[PDB]
Structures are given as structure tokens and as C-alpha cells.
Amino acid sequence: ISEFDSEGSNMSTTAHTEPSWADLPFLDFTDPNFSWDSPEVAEAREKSWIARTPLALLVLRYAEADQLARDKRLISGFRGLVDMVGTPEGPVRDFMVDFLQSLDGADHRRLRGLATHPFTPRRITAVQPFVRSTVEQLIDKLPQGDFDFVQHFPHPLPALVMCQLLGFPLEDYDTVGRLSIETNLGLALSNDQDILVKVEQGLGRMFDYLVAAIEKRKVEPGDDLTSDIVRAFHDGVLDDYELRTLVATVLVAGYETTNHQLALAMYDFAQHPDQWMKIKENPELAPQAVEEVLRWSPTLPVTATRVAAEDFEVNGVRIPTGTPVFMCAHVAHRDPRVFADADRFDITVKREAPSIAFGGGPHFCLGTALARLELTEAVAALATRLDPPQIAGEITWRHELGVAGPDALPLRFGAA
């Protein structure tokens, strides 16, 4: 998410008025040196189900993280944040107030419903051979030495899969990846006009590409998600503005997260090569391994973000209207109430509880099932075909709040 220039302030005034906030641990997650793995983070979770931060209440335990991701009294956060920050009237404000993640209730159900079908079990099964073949072809052409796993694998896979999903030429995967990244939604709640022009231009370039695809599909429809949403448009169900906004939401949400999560898998296995070898010996372990990567290194350590729509109380805490509530999946994933030996990466444990890397409630990740398919096909093939990864240079991390994202991940597969 974009940091908003709360800087503590609105959370501060509320904190000064709420006795039920008096015993809540404080975590300053916006500090450049903060780590989700610091001892004080675990201590905070042991102390309390919820913490205060400068921007939001932060839910630290698994049960409550799922409860509040689903609670209808917690609506999408983006529209209130835009009002607070004072985002000028324009394309950036438009997208932040109207993209699927910002919508609630009937409009949300309507628009989301137009995009759910490619992610049903039968349509995941339908795309699995493409995913498998794409992964195989990427492994085939990997460099033999030290190389950036992002450029050579974690970028192309989800870029190609998004092109295939949305009916873009596969040869546009590089362009599509760039266009997605440069939407820079992580900066969209900035107060700086120069930063917001950069977001405005990124969004504009994306829509340059998307609206051409949409206009093609209006006359030359195919068997793809763009075309399917276009049919809903021809049927009067949504308008042109909604059409492009919905396609853009899906593209942006589906690309960088998946890219990052693939890179994080490799980083985990570089630390634990013995577990890579277990997958190689028994590649049926890949789904369980993927779930352990999602548990231990979720790419969105903050998953569900919400704001209170009314004053209410949950597990002893009064949450006043307008208070942002963020679900800390990273920390919940180490909740000893749910996970055995939670502070160890171990793909060999068959766990009753899944990761909650995809949020929850009506907004839960639209692409959950496709994300897992991509991660599983990748981990199975990489572990079958290659020696364990080891890091080969500086890993460059995205600075965005709530994101664990290697921009570049130099590695080698095997010491030789």
C-alpha cells in the first residue's frame, strides 16, 4: 500500500481517547529499519491480538486476522484515505476510489463477479498446461552461472500468464510487466504533486495499452478474460470506464505479487537447501512447500487492509469509525496457537491451517487459485530439474509498505 501522511496523527488522537487502546503494544512498521521478524514483533503478538502503529491498528493473531478480514463493519480503506490525504481530482484519485479493491457491497459483487470465472477449478485446470509449458521453457533457457532470477524467471512467468489470461500477445510480456509495475500504486496516496504525476503517467501508459486491447476485443473477441468482460459491457452490465478499470485492477494485482513470491521461494530455499532436495526426491511435496513459503515469506506481510465504517468492539477493543485496520499475515503465520514450531521453515509438516497470504472476506485475492498454480508448477519443476539455489549478489528489495518484494534476486543453482 501507499503510505499516507498520517505520521501517527489520526491514530494518535484516537489513541488519546480510547482506554481499550492503553495496553496495546506499539509497532512502528513505517520505520526504514523495522523488521517483521524482530523479537519485539513476536513479543507484541504474545502480549496482544492487536497492536497500534502510526497508520492503523495491526492484527497479529491468526484467528482475529481472519475474523476482521471478513467483518462487514470494516470496509475498504482507500476512499477515506484519499479524502484525508486530499488527492486532487484526476486519474490517480479516480483509480484509487473506483478500482475493485476500493469498492464495497453491491458494486463490488457485480464487478468482481464478471472476473471470477477464469479462477474456478475447471478454468485453472484449463490453463495448467500453459503454465507447465511456460515454466519448462523458462528453465530450458536459464543461464548456467550467476543470474537475476527475476529477469530470467520470476518476471516472465507471471507476465506470460497474465498475457494469456487477458488475451494479450505473449510477445508483449516484457512490456506488460513494466506497465504493471509503473502504475506505482504504492505511491498513490502521496501528498507530493511530483510523485503523483509519476503515478498519473504510469496509470496513463497502462491504460494506453489496455484500452487498445479492449477496443480490439469489442470487435475481435477471443477466449480470454478481456473478451468476457467486454461481453458484459455489450450486455450493458458495466460501462467503458468500469471495463478498463476492472481489467487494470486484475493485471496489476496479478503480476508483481506473483513475481515477488516466486523470488521469495528461491530465497527461502537458498537458506534451507536440504528442503529443496526433499522436493527433488519427492516432488509431490511441492504444494505443501508452496504453502510453507506463503506462511514463512508472504509477499504481502500485510494482507487485508480495511477501515471501520462504524464504532464497534471486538475482543475487548473499541474500534472507532475511520480507524484503519491492517491484517498482519506475516506475524499471524507464526502464531503458536495455530502452527507448530512456527518460527522454523519446514516444508515437511502437513499443517491443518493454511497460510492467509490471500486475505479473506469478499475481497479475498481474486487470483488465489492461479497464484498457487503458478507457484506450485514453478517450485516442482525448479526443484526437480536444478541444484539448490544460492545467492549470488545483492538482493534489491522494494521499499513499499507491506510488501516483501525482491526487485532483483541474483543467484545460481548449484555451487558448480
372 marked ligand binding residue = no
**Residues of this chain that bind ligand HEM (CB under 6 A):** 69, 100-101, 112, 249-250, 253-254, 257-258, 261, 299-300, 303-304, 357-361, 363-367, 370-371
Measure the N-to-C terminal CA separation of the chain; round to a whole number of Å: 40
With CB under 5 A as the contact rule, the residue among 70, 216, 351, 385 that binds Cl ion is: 351
Q: Give the C-alpha separation, 416 to 414, whole Å.
A: 5
Q: If binding is defined by CB under 5 A, does position 340 make contact with Cl ion?
A: yes
Picking from 121, 77, 138, the residue whose alpha carbon sits closest to that of residue 102 is: 77
- Strand-pairing partners, residue 391, are 411
Which residues within the stretch 33-52 sit at the binding site for Cl ion (CB under 5 A)?
45-46
Work out how close the CB of 261 gets to ligand HEM at its nearest, in angstroms, rounded to a whole number: 4
Nearer to ligand HEM, 87 or 164 (CB): 164
Site string (300-339) toward Cl ion, x via CB under 5 A: ---------------------------------------x
Nearer to ligand HEM, 42 or 262 (CB): 262
DSSP state of 354: P
40: cell is 519485539
Residue partners of 319: CB distance under 8 A and separation at least 6: 57, 308, 311, 312, 313, 325
365 marked ligand binding residue = yes
Q: Give the C-alpha separation, 345 to 341, whole Å.
A: 9
Nearer to ligand HEM, 303 or 412 (CB): 303
- Cβ–Cβ under 8 Å, residues 115 and 244: no
Number of residues that bind Cl ion (CB under 5 A): 5
Query: Helix 225-234 to helix 156-166 angle, to the nearest 10 degrees?
Result: 30
Work out how close the CB of 336 gets to Cl ion at its nearest, in angstroms, rounded to a whole number: 5
Work out how close the CB of 351 gets to Cl ion at its nearest, in angstroms, rounded to a whole number: 4
Picking from 39, 44, 76, the residue whose alpha carbon sits closest to that of residue 59 is: 44
Nearer to ligand HEM, 25 or 266 (CB): 266
Work out how close the CB of 116 gets to ligand HEM at its nearest, in angstroms, rounded to a whole number: 9
What is the radius of gyration, based on Cα positions, of the chain?
A: 21
Pairing of strands 57-59, 324-327: parallel
**Which option in Cl ion, ligand HEM, none does residue 134 bind, with CB closer than 5 to 8 A by kind?**
none
306 marked ligand binding residue = yes
CB hemisphere CA count around 16 (13 angstroms): 5
Q: If binding is defined by CB under 5 A, does position 218 make contact with Cl ion?
A: no
Nearer to Cl ion, 117 or 344 (CB): 344
Residue partners of 95: CB distance under 8 A and separation at least 6: 185, 188, 203, 245, 248
318 marked ligand binding residue = no
Work out how close the CB of 296 gets to ligand HEM at its nearest, in angstroms, rounded to a whole number: 13
- Strand-pairing partners, residue 406, are 397
108 marked ligand binding residue = yes
In whole angstroms, how far apart are CA 49 and each of 63, 118, 145, 259? 9, 36, 46, 31
363 marked ligand binding residue = yes
Work out how close the CB of 115 gets to ligand HEM at its nearest, in angstroms, rounded to a whole number: 7
Query: Which residues of the shown chain bind Cl ion in the complex (CB under 5 A)?
Result: 45-46, 339-340, 351
Provide the annotated binding site for heme b.
108, 112, 306, 360, 363, 365
